[PDB]
Write a protein that binds this ligand. Structure first.
Ligand SMILES: CCc1ccccc1CO
Ligand SMILES: CCc1ccccc1CO
Lengths: 158, 158
């Protein structure tokens, strides 16, 4: 009786932080969706420090503390995902965390660039993936945050 | 007598792999520099598998096996570093590896974009750093592979 109850936590990785509203609209939608399932979002800007190294450490700790990462690997400033998000995906991988990724553009990299090379003749990966192969771990690449969250609910029960 | 001798190993993270020569010129220069100090480069394309997941796994293993990562965080396809490299930096951070980074462009992000926002009104970080703050861990951002390697030699002796 009155056993400790673990509340599931998801690290919310993605470039929404760079939206004009600092991600407020995205994070509010995430908060509402997760609240209904008693899941807590771990949001990069929560209780935000002022020093870069402190912000980084807190975010790494959030990844250490999470049950899963849902990472927004949508195009950011071109066809490539956000590198901060990519760092967080790598951190989670090394820690053997469940990593779920989504993108607004699921086309293969060569489809996105329209060629096997970019405008500067740099090679575009040819592995039938939407982004750098390091970011793919065998789990399906989802279309949306919501679809990734549905996978979480099915595969990480309370 | 005849004790085991550890050979130092550095994971060579960076978008050189996307050069037309698949990084041959960069990697050859790296090989020559490291050879002189009895350091072994762990190069992403070494004994390259055909399947994305196998390539990724081998690269993660190289990071697990390394003494340090030297990561090329130079602009790739714009002002942002390569996301594969960023993933690898994240992996290394979580594994408490020595991470050394360099870039061909050390200007602050806001200097690079010329503004506190990009062309789409997305926020450019203002922390006096050349790239996404997750990629900075307190170690100096170097100007070149060689300068990062000199730091390695000074701070990771045999
Ligand atoms: C200010 C940008 C920010 C905020 C929270 C966590 C990470 C970052 C940059 O990666
Ligand atoms: C084929 C490109 C490549 C090769 C080795 C390791 C990683 C990658 C892409 O991230």
């Amino acid at each position: 009786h009155h056993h400790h109850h673990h509340m599931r936590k998801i690290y919310i990785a993605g470039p929404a932080v760079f939206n004009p509203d600092m991600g407020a609209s995205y994070y509010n939608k995430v908060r509402e969706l997760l609240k209904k399932e008693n899941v807590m979002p771990l949001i990069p800007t929560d209780n935000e420090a002022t020093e870069a190294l402190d912000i980084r450490q807190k975010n790494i700790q959030m990844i250490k503390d999470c049950d899963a990462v849902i990472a927004d690997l949508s195009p950011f400033r071109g066809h490539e995902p956000d590198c901060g998000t990519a760092f967080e995906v790598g951190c989670a991988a090394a820690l053997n965390k469940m990593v779920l990724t989504f993108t607004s553009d699921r086309r293969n990299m060569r489809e996105k660039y329209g060629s096997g090379v970019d405008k500067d003749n740099l090679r575009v990966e040819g592995f039938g993936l939407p982004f750098n192969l390091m970011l793919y771990d065998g789990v399906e690449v989802f279309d949306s945050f919501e679809s990734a969250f549905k996978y979480f609910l099915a595969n990480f029960p309370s």
